[PDB]
């Protein structure tokens, strides 16, 4: 069988929390008044929710209302408990209220409003300094939720909401987030395709916070190289092949051999043999102003096959890449 794995940090955070903290199935939802909020316009519809701009008529403030699609009670409770646990943390989206939507008959989560610009437009005007600044802000959120025993599991540009005017950032959509428990096996069907860690792609279930760091690395690569997404696979199998064409196949085999993992035999005729590439390969005259030795080394230390070998969020915040970022 597979060799077991443990997070190298925050390993027993939940072990020593009171059970109320992580036992979300037993959580009792405290409901607000649904008539406090008025839907103004629909912003989007995902697989698990519909998102609306709204007004809180008790203060005439703009808010965001996320009306959950019918889904098993524990997943709904999971997201709620996680949001309440993390509320007030650095750059964590603030859950303001929970109400029962009369039409859907499901919980509607009320969030603080973030005046966002579309990431595709934003990622295209971001300066070298902007990228470092916002990366640092994401790291604050990730070290926080990891230190609080939670992995996000869906880090991607769409879930990093940025108000570029006030240089304000929020990590959103905690619907896939989970509590980390040492040696627990998790569903590998998480994260968006382009941001899936190698551990998910090789069906290794005993993963941890370090998954989020691979996803963050994918975001970084897309930003500094101006290629979104960076690893652009057509499906989950091609996704691993795309990664192997950059990181190389010999380190992939070292990875799966270390945890005594076996690849899907489906890869036998599509994976091939590939050398590890140097990151300078992806540098050109249209992105070189976003690239530095510090950037490439930081990226290199995020994008590792071995989840145990990736920088932790805290380690990442110590990296020379962030030396130029103004501290508060
Ligand atoms: C799609 O999930 C979310 C969306 C938003 C705002 O767009 C805020 C919090 C969320 O969890």
Q: Phi/psi of residue 28, each to 5°?
A: -105, 115
Pairwise CA distance, residues 126 & 120, whole Å: 10
Output the CA 187–ligand 1 centroid distance in Å: 22
Please indicate, yes or no, whether residues 168 and 253 belong to a single structural domain of this protein: yes
- Say whether both 13 and 29 belong to one domain: no
C-alpha–C-alpha distance, residues 211 and 174, integer Å: 15
Collect all residues with Cβ–Cβ distance below 8 Å to 73 and sequence separation of at least 6: none
48 marked as part of a ligand binding site: yes
From 81, 113, 145, the end of a domain falls on: 113
Number of domains in the chain: 2
> Could you tell me if 137 and 74 are in contact, meaning their C-beta atoms sit under 8 angstroms apart?
no
Q: Which residue CA neighbors atom 1 of ligand 1 most closely?
A: 173
- Regarding whether 224 and 91 lie in a shared domain, the answer is no
> Residue 328 gets which letter from DSSP?
-
Q: Of all helices (H) and strands (E), which one includes residue 100?
A: strand 95-100
Length of the chain: 328
Q: Determine whether the shortest distance from the Cβ of 110 to ligand 1 is under 6 A.
A: no
Q: How far is CA 227 from CA 61, 89, 124, 161, in A?
A: 37, 31, 10, 19
Rounded distance, CA 75 to CA 55, Å? 27
Q: Which domain holds residue 128?
A: 5-22+114-328
What DSSP string describes 187-219?
-S--S-GGG--HHHHTT-----THHHHHHHHHH
Q: In units of Å, what resolution does this entry have?
A: 1.8
Examine the domain organization and report whether 37 and 160 are in the same domain.
no
- How many other β-carbons are positioned within 10 Å of the β-carbon of residue 88? 9
Residue where a domain stops, chosen among 64, 81, 113: 113
Same domain, 268 and 125: yes
Cross-strand partners of 66: 51, 109
Looking at the fold, whether 122 and 64 belong to one and the same domain comes out as no
Examine the domain organization and report whether 107 and 129 are in the same domain.
no
Q: For residue 233, count CB atoms less than 10 angstroms from its CB and return exposed for 0-12, middle for 13-18, buried for 19 or more.
A: middle
Q: Residue 325 Cα, ligand 1 centroid: separation in angstroms?
A: 28
Distance of CA 212 to the CA centre of its chain: 5
- CB-hemisphere CA count at 13 Å for 210? 27
- Please indicate, yes or no, whether residues 278 and 314 belong to a single structural domain of this protein: yes
CA separation, residue 45 to residues 42, 51, 78, 275 (Å): 8, 6, 20, 41
| Pair (213, 130) in one structural domain | yes
- The answer on whether 51 is annotated among ligand-binding residues is yes
Residues 96 and 124 both lie in one domain: no
Residue 87, phi-psi category: left (phi > 0), alpha (psi -120 to 50), beta (remainder):
beta
Q: What is the DSSP letter of 92?
A: B
Q: By what method was this entry solved? A: X-ray
Annotated catalytic residues are 154
């Amino acid at each position: 069988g597979p060799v077991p794995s443990r997070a190298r940090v925050y390993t027993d955070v939940n072990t020593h929390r009171p059970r109320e903290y992580w036992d979300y199935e037993s959580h009792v939802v405290e409901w607000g008044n649904q008539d406090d909020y008025q839907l103004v316009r629909k912003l989007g519809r995902g697989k698990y929710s519909e998102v609306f701009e709204a007004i809180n008529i008790t203060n005439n403030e703009k808010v965001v209302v996320k009306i959950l699609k019918p889904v098993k009670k524990k997943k709904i409770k999971r997201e709620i408990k996680i949001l309440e646990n993390l509320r007030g943390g650095p750059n964590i989206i603030t859950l303001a209220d929970i109400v029962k939507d009369p039409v859907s008959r499901t919980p509607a989560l009320v969030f603080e409003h973030v005046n966002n610009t579309d990431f595709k437009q934003l990622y295209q005007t971001l300066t070298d300094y902007d990228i470092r600044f916002y990366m640092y802000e994401i790291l604050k959120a990730l070290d926080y939720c990891h230190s609080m025993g939670i992995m996000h599991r869906d880090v991607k540009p769409h879930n990093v909401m940025i108000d570029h005017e006030h240089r304000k950032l929020r990590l959103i959509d905690w619907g896939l987030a989970e509590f980390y428990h040492p040696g627990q096996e998790y569903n590998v069907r998480v994260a968006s395709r382009y941001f899936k860690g190698p551990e998910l792609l090789v069906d290794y279930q005993m993963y941890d916070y370090s998954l989020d760091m691979w996803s963050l690395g994918c975001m970084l690569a897309s930003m500094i190289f101006r290629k979104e997404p960076f690893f652009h696979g057509h499906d989950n199998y091609d996704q691993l092949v795309r990664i192997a064409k950059v990181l190389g196949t010999e380190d992939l085999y070292d990875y799966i051999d270390k945890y005594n993992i076996e690849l899907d035999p489906r890869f036998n005729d599509i994976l091939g043999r590939h050398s590890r590439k140097r990151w300078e390969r992806f540098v050109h005259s249209e992105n070189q102003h976003l690239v530095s030795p510090e950037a490439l080394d930081f990226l290199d230390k995020l994008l590792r096959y071995d989840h145990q070998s990736r920088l932790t969020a805290r380690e990442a915040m110590e990296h020379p890449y962030f030396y130029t970022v103004v501290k508060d």
